[PDB]
Amino acid sequence: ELPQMVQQLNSPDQQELQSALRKLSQIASGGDEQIQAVIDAGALPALVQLLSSPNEQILQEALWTLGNIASGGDEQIQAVIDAGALPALVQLLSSPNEQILQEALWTLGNIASGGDEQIQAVIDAGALPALVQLLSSPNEQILQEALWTLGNIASGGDEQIQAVIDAGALPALVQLLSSPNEQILQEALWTLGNIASGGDEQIQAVIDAGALPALVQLLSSPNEQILQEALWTLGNIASGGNEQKQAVKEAGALEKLEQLQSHENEKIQKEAQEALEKLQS
Numbered sequence: 001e002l003p004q005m006v007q008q009l010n011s012p013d014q015q016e017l018q019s020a021l022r023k024l025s026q027i028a029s030g031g032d033e034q035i036q037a038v039i040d041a042g043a044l045p046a047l048v049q050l051l052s053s054p055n056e057q058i059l060q061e062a063l064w065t066l067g068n069i070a071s072g073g074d075e076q077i078q079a080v081i082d083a084g085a086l087p088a089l090v091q092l093l094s095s096p097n098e099q100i101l102q103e104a105l106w107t108l109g110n111i112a113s114g115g116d117e118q119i120q121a122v123i124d125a126g127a128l129p130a131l132v133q134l135l136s137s138p139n140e141q142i143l144q145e146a147l148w149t150l151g152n153i154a155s156g157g158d159e160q161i162q163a164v165i166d167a168g169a170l171p172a173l174v175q176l177l178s179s180p181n182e183q184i185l186q187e188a189l190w191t192l193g194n195i196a197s198g199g200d201e202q203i204q205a206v207i208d209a210g211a212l213p214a215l216v217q218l219l220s221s222p223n224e225q226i227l228q229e230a231l232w233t234l235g236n237i238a239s240g241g242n243e244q245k246q247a248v249k250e251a252g253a254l255e256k257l258e259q260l261q262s263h264e265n266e267k268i269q270k271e272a273q274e275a276l277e278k279l280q281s
Contacts, residue, residue, distance in 0.1 A: 044083035070110035086125035105145035128167035177214035193233035
């Protein structure tokens with residue numbers, strides 16, 4: 001079974017290569033134990049090589065297989081990294097084929113769902129400037145994939161947060177707080193919340209980027225999920241130092257937060273209360 005399949009990934013007969021590729025992709029879309037069988041069979045170097053196939057269908061299906069491998073456990077994500085997939089994945093971020101572009105983004109997002117070391121490998125492969133550019137894609141699906149991927153990177157340690165800030169992501173993220181698309185809006189809030197879960201100077205960069213007026217407004221959102229994400233991100237900002245806290249107060253937050261203490265949702269009441277007590281000493 002799997003050793004023959006892997007051999008055929010190098011076959012000059014394209015029907016063999018594709019037949020082997022479709023069976024491996026099937027297997028890699030199962031559980032982690034199946035993913036491991038594929039990795040242990042030695043499929044990764046050849047799958048990485050197929051990221052240069054001039055055949056677009058083959059390229060895309062190799063990409064989908066890697067993305068599935070990368071939805072596995074952190075050691076499975078690390079094998080993808082150790083097989084040298086990141087440089088090609090980053091190049092693919094400038095593919096004019098939007099289905100290929102999307103699958104590269106999805107795969108990088110999966111890799112960035114790993115541990116902080118896996119996230120750092122994504123940063124070190126130079127993914128950030130392209131991800132930041134993709135935040136102004138006219139394609140909503142592309143934009144959402146880039147956003148998801150950035151949010152994942154921003155969910156790592158403070159050094160990972162710092163690279164996102166350093167790559168210039170903040171102004172784009174704050175602009176997306178005007179998005180009329182509710183999913184985009186939610187994921188931008190969530191990404192800013194993750195940045196604002198860092199150090200006080202990382203909180204200050206969010207403030208400096210102009211996020212507070214939209215955050216405070218969104219405490220009155222009719223979508224409870226949006227309200228909650230705004231309130232979480234704001235509560236993170238309010239956990240900063242005195243200069244951070246003073247800026248929250250001057251943005252008008254005390255009045256909305258008090259209003260929230262009578263909200264029917266207990267998580268909202270409690271979050272608002274925590275926020276207020278931080279802000280008031």
